[PDB]
Amino acid sequence: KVFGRCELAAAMKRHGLDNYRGYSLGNWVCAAKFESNFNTQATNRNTDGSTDYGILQINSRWWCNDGRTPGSRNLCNIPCSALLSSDITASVNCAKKIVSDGNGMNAWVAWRNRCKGTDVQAWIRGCRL
Numbered sequence: 751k752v753f754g755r756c757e758l759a760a761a762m763k764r765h766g767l768d769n770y771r772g773y774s775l776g777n778w779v780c781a782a783k784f785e786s787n788f789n790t791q792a793t794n795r796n797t798d799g800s801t802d803y804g805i806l807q808i809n810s811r812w813w814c815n816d817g818r819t820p821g822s823r824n825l826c827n828i829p830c831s832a833l834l835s836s837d838i839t840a841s842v843n844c845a846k847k848i849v850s851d852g853n854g855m856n857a858w859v860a861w862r863n864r865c866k867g868t869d870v871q872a873w874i875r876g877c878r879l
């Protein structure tokens with residue numbers, strides 16, 4: 751599923767990400783835009799052999815099991831394929847644990863390099879929230 755911007759904003763708010771760990775909704779929408787272009791099916795291989803999955807490009811070295819990332823963890827206790835669903839529940843629940851793990855939203859490379867320190871409020875402009 752390719753979410754609309756305000757569509758994804760509304761789904762993220764419903765699942766409790768607006769101001770989760772202090773990060774306003776626009777941060778999460780901006781992160782998803784540059785991680786996945788709002789595409790729940792997005793996957794990308796990393797040089798270390800891990801893969802990033804879904805709307806928030808959650809990585810198989812730490813967070814989910816894809817059966818092909820040796821010596822990895824599965825800290826969200828979930829198959830990585832669950833992160834590709836049109837329903838973002840699994841991705842949001844896993845994202846909550848990631849952003850709680852010490853480094854905040856810096857865990858998302860695209861957020862650090864493209865959203866952090868910008869006017870992220872613009873990402874929810876016009877949305878009926």
Ligand SMILES: CC(=O)N[C@@H]1[C@@H](O)[C@H](O[C@@H]2O[C@H](CO)[C@@H](O[C@@H]3O[C@H](CO)[C@@H](O)[C@H](O)[C@H]3NC(C)=O)[C@H](O)[C@H]2NC(C)=O)[C@@H](CO)O[C@H]1O
Binds near residue numbers: 848
């Ligand atoms: C969205 C996503 O999947 N992002 C991936 C990152 O999560 C990952 O970064 C590494 O994440 C682990 C787990 O959060 C980091 O470990 C934590 O490090 C902090 C100290 O910095 C410590 O407080 C935590 O206890 C520790 N958690 C553990 C050990 O479970 C680790 O620092 C991150 N590594 C780096 C190089 O930033 C990166 C890299 O694999 O991938 C993203 O895609």
Ligand SMILES: [Cl-]
Binds near residue numbers: 859863864
């Ligand atoms: Cl980047």
